[PDB]
């Protein structure tokens, strides 16, 4: 699961109609990507284009300003069946008394 990072500080420009809205596993909202897209990091002197076609998570929005080396997107290309998959359980403990 490679994480794409911003090459420099600048605005993000991309066409939001191609990406599909989704919810990330971290509870955050994101744009699902299924087709090769081109995003442009608009900086003071240069423009950067970096994206990967397959199923990825876009954790940014159009016209949003981002700083350098921030996690713009998550490629998430690595996916396969896990024979060691375990149904681990976690319990939520109340922090206050009541009903």
């Amino acid at each position: 699961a490679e994480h794409v990072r911003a090459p420099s500080n600048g605005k993000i420009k991309f066409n939001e109609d191609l990406v599909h809205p989704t919810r990330t596993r971290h509870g955050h909202p994101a744009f699902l990507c299924s087709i090769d897209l081109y995003v442009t990091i608009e900086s003071e002197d240069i423009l950067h284009n970096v994206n990967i076609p397959p199923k990825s998570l876009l954790l940014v929005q159009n016209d949003q300003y981002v700083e350098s080396e921030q996690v713009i997107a998550e490629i998430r290309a690595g996916i396969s069946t896990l024979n060691f998959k375990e149904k681990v359980r976690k319990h939520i403990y109340s922090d206050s008394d009541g009903e």
Binding site: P7, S8, N9, E44, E67, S68, E69
Partner: protein, 204 residues
């Protein structure tokens, strides 16, 4: 393919990395006369002749030229499968051949002998083509400049030819340091660009 096997005794055999170039040699005491009317290109150590790509007007008269070789040494590390098996293998790997016409077709043993750096013919093994080089005369004097003081600078993988005076030359240390400094500056800027403070910064 010409389909007839020529007699290579009457031709100049020039060896390249991936090709062999043949140029007809008129009878001469010193083997420096070239005839560009007939020329052939062959695969490495092959007797199947062919016609090369003439990409420039070739001289139609006998001229006296000096051959030179351009390339890079490939020092490899051959596997050792024997006690006294060699530790290294060195190959010249010629890539481009430069033919420099002698000034006024004079012989090498003449009292006044100079090379005409305005008529350079290059041979490329990759493209199997022979063409004429483009030089940029910068020595004062125009066409009346004396040929006893000239220096031909060849850079950019045999693509840049410049004629400058002999006194106005750079020692090898100077050009090596220049290229190293340029590459280091480019790589350092590339490395420091990713830092979030690259915008408000100053290279000192």
């Amino acid at each position: 393919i010409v389909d007839y096997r020529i007699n290579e005794e009457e031709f100049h055999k020039i060896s390249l990395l991936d090709c062999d170039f043949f140029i007809r040699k008129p009878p001469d005491p010193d083997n420096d006369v070239y005839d560009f009317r007939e020329m052939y290109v062959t695969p490495p150590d092959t007797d199947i002749y062919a016609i090369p790509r003439v990409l420039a007007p070739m001289p139609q008269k006998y001229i006296r030229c000096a051959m030179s070789d351009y390339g890079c040494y490939n020092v490899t590390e051959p596997p050792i499968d024997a006690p006294r098996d060699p530790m290294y293998k060195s190959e010249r790997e010629v890539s481009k051949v430069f033919l420099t016409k002698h000034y006024r077709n004079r012989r090498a043993g003449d009292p006044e002998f100079a090379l005409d750096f305005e008529e350079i013919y290059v041979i490329d093994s990759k493209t199997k083509s022979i063409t004429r080089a483009k030089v940029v005369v910068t020595v004062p004097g125009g066409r009346n400049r004396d040929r006893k003081n000239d220096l031909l600078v060849i850079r950019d993988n045999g693509n840049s030819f410049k004629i400058i005076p002999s006194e106005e030359r750079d020692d090898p240390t100077t050009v090596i340091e220049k290229e190293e400094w340029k590459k280091s500056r480019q790589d350092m800027e590339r490395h420091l660009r990713k830092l979030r403070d690259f915008s408000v910064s100053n290279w000192f």
